[PDB]
């Protein structure tokens, strides 16, 4: 199969430089271009230019002229992004793709999110969340979990390890003061807890934070 | 540089009606050589990178549904999708690779209607771990709504309170269409224990009055 890995997510702060990968795999790496494409939060896509894999030139689009740079490590099928003098306006998806004789992108990779800013990296807090001892229990019941006062994204959370999936919604973080918080709920029978343990399971891969939250009653 | 026009913004249909979204482009996409307009559609849904669906205008890539078709020569395309349903709900793109640069139009999102359905309202006090600190966040989960629009109030001992509150709503369900969202009051662990009536009032338009859930601290 054909596939296309890039690097996890990037915190850097203005004025320094970045630099993330994309490995190719399942075809001929120099036998098609590389495209970059990129898009900023809640926006739209926007072509950066490509790099001929054969040749090792690059072309930017009149946006990214400058501070921008495709390179290749042909040995390995990786294509390279590298940005200098990163601005706060930096922030955002950069993905990688393939691009077909026919005009189009066949393949594409996951997306590297890199995020400009001053704000230093902290660890959230991971507090659960259990109906009030004095609440009215119903057939159903929703637990939660609040991730509060973290840096940068992302946090990952899951349920019983991934074995509670339905029922659940993590809710976008939302950043204040250089902090994000974040919150998830479950809903499970009011016949499965607290009789049958429920916890989320919340990492913070910039903090190597790692914490199993048991949901307890009040 | 081609500009590539696209409208709607956004579209709203009920599962099963079929939608239709246009794409206009500056100037003929339309290559000689190959007779081929050099026009693609690509769907993305949230967090995830972009799909082709349509390329050469009207050519399906193989793995897509006969329900999606793309049609247009020149400047005028259009992408149809039949029996909508909610795994379509995302933004949908078209791309030109006509003459670089290539250039993607601004997308059209797709968002499903529903029955209108009140959400189901949970609130919890702070956590013992976070007032072991000096934190007290309050937080109430308005969970599987429709539509989106919701209104949150905190009042504490009866009194509003605009200040401390952040609010974050997810993203249309991939599977039943509803819309969840989370309120979260954050106060000192002092302002806390200072008051005891704690509630989350939601305005929606499924009801005349504010689903209204609470808690009074001396009762815990």
Not at chain 2, 165 to 177: A, G
Request: net charge neutral.
């Amino acid at each position: 199969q054909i596939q296309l890995v890039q690097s996890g997510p990037e915190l850097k702060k203005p004025g320094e430089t970045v630099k993330i990968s994309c490995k190719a795999s399942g075809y001929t790496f120099t036998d098609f271009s590389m495209h970059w494409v990129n898009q900023a939060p809640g926006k739209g896509l926007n072509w950066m230019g490509w790099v001929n894999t054969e040749t090792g030139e690059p072309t930017y689009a009149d946006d990214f002229k400058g501070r921008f740079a495709f390179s290749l490590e042909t040995s390995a099928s990786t294509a390279y992004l590298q940005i200098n003098s990163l601005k706060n306006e930096d922030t955002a998806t950069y993905f990688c793709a393939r691009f077909l004789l026919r005009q189009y992108f066949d393949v594409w990779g996951a997306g590297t999110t890199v995020t400009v800013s001053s704000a230093k990296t902290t660890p959230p807090s991971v507090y659960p969340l259990a109906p009030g001892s004095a609440a009215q229990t119903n057939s159903m019941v929703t637990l939660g979990c609040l991730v509060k006062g973290y840096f940068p994204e992302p946090v990952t959370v899951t349920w019983n390890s991934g074995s509670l999936s339905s029922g659940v919604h993590t809710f976008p973080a939302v950043l204040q003061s250089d902090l994000y918080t974040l919150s998830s709920s479950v809903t499970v029978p009011s016949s499965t807890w607290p009789s049958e343990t429920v916890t989320c399971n919340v990492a913070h891969p910039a903090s190597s934070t790692k914490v199993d939250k048991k949901i307890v009653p009040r | 540089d081609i500009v590539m026009s696209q409208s709607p913004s956004s579209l709203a249909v009920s599962a099963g009606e079929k939608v239709t979204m246009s794409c206009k482009s500056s100037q003929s996409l339309l290559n000689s050589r190959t007779r081929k307009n050099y026009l693609a559609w690509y769907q993305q849904k949230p967090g995830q990178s972009p799909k082709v669906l349509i390329y050469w205008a009207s050519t399906r890539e193989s793995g897509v549904p006969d329900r999606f078709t793309g049609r247009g020569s020149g400047t005028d395309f259009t992408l149809t999708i039949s029996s909508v349903q909610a795994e379509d709900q995302a933004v949908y793109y078209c791309k030109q690779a006509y003459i670089p640069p290539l250039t993607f139009g601004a997308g059209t999102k797709l968002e499903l209607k529903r029955a209108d359905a009140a959400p189901t309202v949970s609130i919890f006090p702070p956590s013992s771990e976070q007032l072991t600190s000096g934190g007290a966040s309050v937080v109430c989960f308005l969970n599987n709504f429709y539509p989106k629009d919701i209104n949150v109030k905190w009042k504490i001992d009866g009194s509003e309170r605009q200040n401390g509150v952040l609010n974050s709503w997810t993203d249309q369900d991939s599977k039943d269409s509803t819309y969840s969202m989370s309120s979260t009051l954050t106060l000192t662990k002092d302002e806390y224990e200072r008051h005891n009536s704690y509630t989350c009032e939601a305005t929606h338009k499924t009801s005349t009055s504010p689903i209204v859930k609470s808690f009074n601290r001396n009762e815990c």
